[PDB]
Design a protein around this ligand. Sequence first.
Ligand SMILES: *Cc1c(COP(=O)(O)O)cnc(C)c1O
Ligand SMILES: *Cc1c(COP(=O)(O)O)cnc(C)c1O
Lengths: 396, 396
Amino acid sequence: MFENITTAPADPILGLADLFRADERPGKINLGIGVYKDETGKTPVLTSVKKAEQYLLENETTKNYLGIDGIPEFGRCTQELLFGKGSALINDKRARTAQTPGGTGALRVAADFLAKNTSVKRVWVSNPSWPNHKSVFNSAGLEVREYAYYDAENHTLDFDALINSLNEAQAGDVVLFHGCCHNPTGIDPTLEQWQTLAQLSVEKGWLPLFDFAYQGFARGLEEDAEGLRAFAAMHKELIVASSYSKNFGLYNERVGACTLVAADSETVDRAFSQMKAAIRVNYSSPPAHGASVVATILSNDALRAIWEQELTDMRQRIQRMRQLFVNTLQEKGANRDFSFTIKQNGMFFFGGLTKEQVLRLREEFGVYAVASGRLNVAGMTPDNLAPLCEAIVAVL
Amino acid sequence: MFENITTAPADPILGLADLFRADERPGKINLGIGVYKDETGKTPVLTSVKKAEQYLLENETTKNYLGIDGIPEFGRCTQELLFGKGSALINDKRARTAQTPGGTGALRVAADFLAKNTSVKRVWVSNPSWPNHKSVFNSAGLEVREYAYYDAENHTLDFDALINSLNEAQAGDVVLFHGCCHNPTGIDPTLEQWQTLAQLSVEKGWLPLFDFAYQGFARGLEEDAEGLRAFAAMHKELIVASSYSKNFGLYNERVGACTLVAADSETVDRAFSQMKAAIRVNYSSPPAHGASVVATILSNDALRAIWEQELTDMRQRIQRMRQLFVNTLQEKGANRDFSFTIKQNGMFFFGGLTKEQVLRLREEFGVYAVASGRLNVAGMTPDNLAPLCEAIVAVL
Ligand SMILES: *Cc1c(COP(=O)(O)O)cnc(C)c1O
Ligand SMILES: *Cc1c(COP(=O)(O)O)cnc(C)c1O
């Protein structure tokens, strides 16, 4: 039965891990997958997380199944983090949250839900966008269309082009937005541009779907959510797929959430029942450990204070490495100004390298990056910055 | 967009949890969902598990993403547990294992894989069978057909009827078998019946799919796998969806595995690449905690010895409660012989109650069981056995 199966194409991002591993050269530098690394080049477990795990080990008395939607406390803390402590959405009980295996899991659940229970047939994603967005929605049988976003010449958000392209989007179509720290461009809409998009979305009748995987890495927890909150103030319905992989450093514990918002509690409850149905036939119920840690931290004033500072330190180290990256490039004699990367939010640097330059950096220098030219700044350290820049200058 | 969504039907098993919770009557007894309970009526964390978690807390240095297929050690230990320490399948590298979010997750991955990469169009399940089997495969777009299995009059395996019904199954069809502790009948094929089924399957050209969620609860770890191993000795290809939820008491950590077997390593690798593709667009990579615990226990002689004894104690308490259940029924004056339940393997008692008797036990006595008449014996304790039996006798 498996004689004629074709070999699946490698993932453009996750597939780098296997290549980086096979490579046996000493000075190899991994700047691919978007995981945080400290000054030592390691991806440590946060202290707040380790303290929460200690707590769980000491107080957990059972591993009995969680409900389909997961830990209730986790859902409440998530909604407050997304919409604001005293949001009307929460008070009017218009939102339901399902704990999921990561933000990717959240996206898949959203996709299955839409495909089976609504008239949705098309999803619009930015150009360029996170590669797995097309793959996930296509798997659910939904077609994916792209809308203009990045101005490759000026390294900015081409708002006029964004508006023009989205006018081809029809009422009932889903439009996907990155909450903050757009992956891979690092360029986000200004608060006024978000407000304009919110208004346009209501009038055009689009169903907004936010992929919120970097809350806290642009400016701050609350600040990074203003675009989403601008949308939530005017929309009757919306879906949010968030992740705690990066801001809690819980990558492998698969911790995320899919939040559904409707006009009223009666409607969201009915709709959420079908979302639970979609979960039931996938993995049944979500993994407890990771989400337990998150709920424990967010609900304890002391632990939350430690975590928030750790998040702050992460964001600040990336920003520092960014300015240092640009400085070292000019010092090493780069024949191009990359100062535009200072305007980018998040962990990545994007827009200055071609596919061939990336391949050459890998083959000749052992520097690993995504074929699209996306570099993980969070993977840069004071120790590998010099050789990194010498390699880059060598391929320009 | 969500105005016309219909309320999804409640799950016949997982939905009991919500009903049992709403119930405020004092003496309510929960015998629904198949989770183990000790003499105290609690579902404790195994000691071997708690020791492994202590180990992880002390030695884990990162939460970085696992590969798509999970922890390699977890996969090796799983294959040895399934096929035997020195199996040819392992030596000839004909099997690949993907760590999944529970056995249900394993089933979904298998379903997506089959639907997208093979000519499979039909899956055969036993009558009666675990309800979520139909739901999971149907969700992937595969039709489900039933084959005769249980003899409701004699409370035994109707082998002749099984053979007759499966003759309508065509080459290229998938036939699903419960490794041991058939859910919900508790009636398994004898080793000779397994051998006969293995031979017939090869000649008919069926693709076997084993759901192995109770290894260790029938007779023992090795013994419970002889049926699967009989199949693995004659088949070129097969799929195994196993779970560690019950034998490790890790229900909410979602720990399972989907094992793929092919004629040779070259073929299984090609096929497994497409299985990884199916995972990639679902939840990306599996949750680490639960699987880490399992790998830690199985790979450490000391911890494994403690765990195996705990598994043994679990199996033995259920068997004891079974004989006590039958004894108390006759002592309380039941007007029917239920001694046939002694022949049943696993956590359940099945075949003696009608749908109405189950409803009445719930409404009038606060006793919760599955509408099909399946009772969780593992939920019976020396303290609730008396009132339980008085209620049952009252509805016969
Ligand atoms: C990290 C990320 C996610 C979700 O990641 P998970 O590891 O599955 O939680 C989703 N979308 C984008 C754009 C991301 O960067
Ligand atoms: C328990 C069980 C499973 C899998 O359960 P998970 O909790 O998802 O690991 C699968 N099939 C049957 C018949 C089961 O009893």
